[PDB]
Amino acid sequence: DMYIERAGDITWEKDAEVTGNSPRLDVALDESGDFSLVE
Amino acid sequence: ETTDGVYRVMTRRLLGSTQVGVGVMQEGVFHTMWHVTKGAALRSGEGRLDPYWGDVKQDLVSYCGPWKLDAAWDGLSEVQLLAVPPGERAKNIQTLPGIFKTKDGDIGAVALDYPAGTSGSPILDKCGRVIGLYGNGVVIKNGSYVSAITQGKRE
Numbered sequence: 001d002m003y004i005e006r007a008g009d010i011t012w013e014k015d016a017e018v019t020g021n022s023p024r025l026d027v028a029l030d031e032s033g034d035f036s037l038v039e
Numbered sequence: 040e041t042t043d044g045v046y047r048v049m050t051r052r053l054l055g056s057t058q059v060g061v062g063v064m065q066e067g068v069f070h071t072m073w074h075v076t077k078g079a080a081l082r083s084g085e086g087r088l089d090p091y092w093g094d095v096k097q098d099l100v101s102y103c104g105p106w107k108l109d110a111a112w113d114g115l116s117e118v119q120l121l122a123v124p125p126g127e128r129a130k131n132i133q134t135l136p137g138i139f140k141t142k143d144g145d146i147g148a149v150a151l152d153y154p155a156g157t158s159g160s161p162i163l164d165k166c167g168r169v170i171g172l173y174g175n176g177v178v179i180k181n182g183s184y185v186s187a188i189t190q191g192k193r194e
């Protein structure tokens with residue numbers, strides 16, 4: 001049985017931890033909602 | 040509880056209380072990823088949320104009403120992932136999204152790695168609007184995880 005618990009407000013926060021890159025990837029999406037890489 | 044904001048999706052089925060995902064309450068509608076709940080009903084205190092709309096291919100599901108989130112990534116600016124990790128506080132992380140090029144169009148993508156129970160955490164633009172949900176993606180050639188910015192359609 002599942003339940004929800006509030007975790008916070010949805011706001012943009014200035015001076016947040018900036019990380020992660022921006023890769024451009026060729027992908028395919030199947031009938032089951034699974035993404036895969038096309039090469 | 041129907042106040043706007045980010046929520047944890049939990050279960051008491053396995054050992055202790057386990058966080059299976061995250062979701063967004065907006066305009067009386069709860070939005071999450073299909074793989075988090077599998078379309079099952081949800082409890083909110085003494086209340087009950089029934090599924091309203093869902094799609095396994097988009098990997099999205101809405102509760103109490105139709106999908107309300109219609110903001111889109113502008114294809115240029117940095118965005119924030121409001122990550123809600125299991126057993127840890129809500130944390131904003133800023134990044135410039137990459138792209139998933141598909142035969143049906145380009146989609147924004149965030150290169151951030153978090154526990155599986157973080158699926159459903161919202162992605163925001165500079166005005167605080169939800170441009171999509173984190174948690175459906177792929178593993179690249181180095182073992183790292185890259186998620187789509189998955190957005191529904193507001194009817």
Ligand SMILES: Cc1cnccc1NC(=O)c1cccn(C[C@@H]2CCNC2)c1=O
Pocket residue numbers: 032033034035074098152153154155157158173174175176184
């Ligand atoms: C969210 C996340 C964050 N960080 C690392 C890994 C994951 N996740 C997965 O590796 C994963 C493994 C199996 C199944 N699904 C969900 C299916 C994908 C289409 N819908 C079902 C997953 O997301």
